[PDB]
């Protein structure tokens, strides 16, 4: 029942807004309301900054709770079962647009994890099983790399004909890239060497280096060709924008 006339709107992380009563109700507390995913969460607080705890109930009987940091710099959005205690889902979002969302099963184990970085790229882990495996997906600007997660690593894979390029992610989180060619003709088989110090994969064909693929700290990929003798690199390095272009680079 808060309007433009009797409240103020406060911007929050996660592209949300809270309305805050200008006047305290009896109890000397400010009323708060915030809309998320079609439900109006309500709460009260002693501050009128827009921080506090708001709650609701979904049509499926789940209980929802939104906590806004005192700083308005971090929100936490949780979904519980009917009992208000068993966790179904939790999402933490910061002012920098970074966020982390997870889903849990009966035993409290993580069954899905979405990681969103500040730039907007994401790592998406779905169908996680008790053995630690599940489907994996990294969402970049212009394309999506699909693969699998396992207790040892995350592996994303791109295929063009006989050539498979794999982006590995350890549990520590430093990337490692390999390439394997099914083509068994020594004249056209592509091989690759990985330098961790520079995050570069060098592709060789017929014992001559042909391209450099740089996997940058900004979650982008660049490609640059060697000259026809495989000794020095040529011209400028192009930033990859489409899945097609990664496939061209593997042809």
């Amino acid at each position: 029942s808060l309007d433009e006339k009797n409240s103020v709107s406060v911007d929050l992380p996660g592209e949300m807004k809270v309305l805050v009563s200008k006047e305290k109700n009896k109890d000397g507390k400010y009323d708060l309301i915030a809309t998320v995913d079609k439900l109006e969460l309500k709460g009260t607080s002693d501050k009128n900054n827009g921080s506090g705890v708001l709650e609701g109930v979904k049509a499926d009987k789940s209980k929802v709770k939104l906590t806004i940091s005192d700083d308005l710099g971090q929100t936490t959005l949780e979904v519980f079962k009917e009992d208000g205690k068993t966790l179904v889902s939790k999402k933490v979002t910061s002012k920098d647009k970074s966020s982390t969302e997870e889903k849990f099963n009966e035993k409290g184990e993580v069954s899905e994890k979405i990681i969103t970085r500040a730039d907007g790229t994401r790592l998406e882990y779905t169908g996680i099983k008790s053995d630690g495996s599940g489907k994996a997906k990294e969402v970049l600007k212009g394309y999506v790399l699909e693969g699998t997660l396992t207790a040892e690593k995350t592996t994303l894979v791109v295929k063009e004909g006989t050539v498979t390029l794999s982006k590995n992610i350890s549990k520590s989180g430093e990337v490692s890239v390999e390439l394997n060619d099914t083509d068994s003709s020594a004249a056209t088989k592509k091989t690759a060497a990985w330098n961790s110090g520079t995050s570069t994969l060098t592709i060789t064909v017929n014992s001559k280096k042909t391209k450099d693929l740089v996997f940058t700290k900004e979650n982008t990929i660049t490609v640059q060709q060697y000259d026809s003798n495989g000794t020095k690199l040529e011209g400028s390095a192009v930033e990859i924008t489409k899945l097609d272009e990664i496939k061209n680079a593997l042809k």
């Epitope: 205690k85 068993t86 966790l87 939790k90 849990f104 009966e106 035993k107 409290g108 184990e109 993580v110």
Partner: antibody, heavy 122, light 108 residues
Framework: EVQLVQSGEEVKKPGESLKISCKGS????????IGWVRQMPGKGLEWMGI????????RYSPSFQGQVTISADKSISTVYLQWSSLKASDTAMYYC???????????????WGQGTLVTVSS | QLTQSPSSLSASVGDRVTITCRAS??????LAWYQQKPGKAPKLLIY???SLESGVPSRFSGSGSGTDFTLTISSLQPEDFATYYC???????????FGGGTKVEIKR
């Protein structure tokens, strides 16, 4: 309705075996962690272990692992705590309690049995 | 890892009462509060630092940050004279630690 009913008072001698039980009601027993907590006379509370009745997954406190055995019988909604050879220092109140827990963020007991008093002495 | 400071606290019916719990390292929101009366089983009051359990009166409140947590009772009632325990959780591997307890007793 949630109710945990523990078995009755025990007076035993050292070196005897003992198994005490806890039966739950008013919730889906096989879908919640359930656990055991010790309170020695005049002292505080100490966690012993938890079990998931659905598949008998067990997490013991260090400092109790290898000292006791926790088990479950999903078909009668009962969890057990058992000693092979009691010692006088096992004299204590024992509580069974339902355990709410999620990944590495939280772990607490929201409902408690009434308690089982165990006396161990020559 | 968990130190409960007041240890024994004297107050009257209608008083404002604060109990503190200090953790040896940050524990985020993995803290719960219980009440226990002599002869009776513990009872959950607060979980996730500040969340009130169903059926516990509104005069109970919890708060805290990294390593400092507080349980507050607005206006003490006679059924609130009892012992209170904080309790923390750590996850790798599973570990639960209770505070030493704070007995809240009647002032005279």
């Amino acid at each position: 309705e949630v109710q945990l009913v523990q078995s009755g008072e025990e007076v035993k001698k050292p070196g005897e075996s003992l198994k005490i039980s806890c039966k739950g009601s008013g919730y889906k027993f096989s879908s919640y962690w359930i656990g055991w907590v010790r309170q020695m006379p005049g002292k505080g509370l100490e966690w012993m272990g938890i079990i998931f009745p659905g598949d008998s997954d067990k997490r013991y406190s260090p400092s109790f692992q290898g000292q006791v055995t926790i088990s479950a019988d999903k078909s009668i909604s009962t969890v057990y705590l058992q000693w092979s050879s009691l010692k006088a220092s096992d004299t204590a109140m024992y509580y069974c309690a339902r355990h709410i827990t999620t990944h590495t963020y939280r772990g607490f007991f929201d409902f408690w049995g009434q308690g089982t008093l165990v006396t161990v002495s020559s | 890892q968990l130190t409960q400071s007041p240890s024994s606290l004297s107050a009257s019916v209608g008083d404002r009462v604060t109990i503190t719990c200090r953790a040896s390292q940050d524990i985020s929101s993995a803290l719960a509060w219980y009440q226990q009366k002599p002869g009776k089983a513990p009872k959950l009051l607060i979980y996730d630092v500040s969340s009130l359990e169903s059926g516990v009166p509104s005069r109970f409140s919890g708060s805290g940050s990294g390593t400092d947590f507080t349980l507050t009772i607005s206006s003490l009632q006679p059924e609130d004279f009892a012992t209170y325990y904080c309790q923390q959780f750590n996850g790798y591997p599973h570990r639960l630690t209770f505070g030493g307890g704070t007995k809240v007793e009647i002032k005279r």
